[PDB]
Symmetry: C3
Subunit: 138 residues, 3 copies
């Protein structure tokens, strides 16, 4: 088939747009809000999916941030590594390889984001990578 | 098609279970032993594929650990990055981005795991990521 | 379908060979120049895609190296993480997780390679990973 639109919504009503192709047992899904572009012949701008403190579950354990989501598709994806920027409350920031999965809990999709220790509380995580998950359904 | 079960077996008779879809020229394969879950509404448990010293070939060179495998499918996959925990003989442990491929040697599948230097001998490598390889056959 | 050959060419006339499968809306493309092999029963050799200074655009900003390409397919891929070795002018070298995308600018394909700061000017970037992109067309 051709690519169908969809979205997830966060606790704070942020909308995470994606396109997907469902060929069961295969579901391939890309997030489309942050597709970077060359804005002129020599400059590449990255774009961020920006997730705030209030998008995550509390308490956070083991550098694992859980984003409960509503709507969208319901998959147990593999883990994909991403470029993260972790913004601390003191506006200090750390660039990291993050690891992202989609999982299902209580019939709800959740995005699992795992990263490294940071010296402070997190205000914001920015995903600077274009994320695509290839998933096996059943 | 829908997802078919399979497994690889290690030198020490550890069984590495996967599901795959074969649409030649495409083979997509996920390892399924360590699919993490949210065990309650706020906690995500990672699971490990645990590979011991005796699962690897000797001598090890250039932080490259080779796991000879029996059975399963026979692919030259791309490289996927993973979350590793490298357990040293002194039970010290290091969290790392590893890079994994499947390759074929002497008609046998081998899993290639590459990581960073550690200050000691390795007792165990745990893969904490859900691994899926998309492969091109011929 | 089965896997079709193709290539991209760099500013300096380096040829980057790939195989792909196009099932629109899906395009899956692997680079094939650097498929590593076990050369004997205990040794795995990585192979590099070697990109020189003159393959990149100037000026470089924010550890982002842009490789303008000619020919090949024209995709907005997701980001894939890779093993990089960054060779400096003083022949010092740094092993890094890089992040690679294919993007389109002025109807031309460009490879976007992003990595970490290095203490010097870059002479060469080697991609030691086998790269495969799964892409969504339209």
């Amino acid at each position: 088939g051709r690519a169908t639109n969809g979205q997830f919504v966060t606790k704070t009503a942020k909308v995470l747009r994606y396109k997907f192709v469902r060929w069961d047992a295969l579901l391939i899904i890309q997030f489309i809000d942050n597709i970077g572009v060359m804005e002129n012949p020599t400059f590449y701008r990255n774009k961020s999916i920006e997730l705030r403190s209030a998008d995550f579950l509390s308490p956070m354990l083991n550098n694992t941030y859980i984003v409960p989501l509503n709507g969208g598709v319901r998959v147990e994806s593999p883990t994909i590594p991403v470029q993260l920027e972790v913004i601390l409350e003191n506006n200090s920031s750390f660039i990291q390889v993050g690891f992202v999965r989609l999982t299902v809990k209580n019939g709800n999709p959740h995005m699992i984001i795992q990263c490294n220790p940071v010296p402070g509380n997190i205000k914001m995580i920015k995903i600077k990578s274009v994320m695509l998950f290839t998933c096996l359904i059943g």
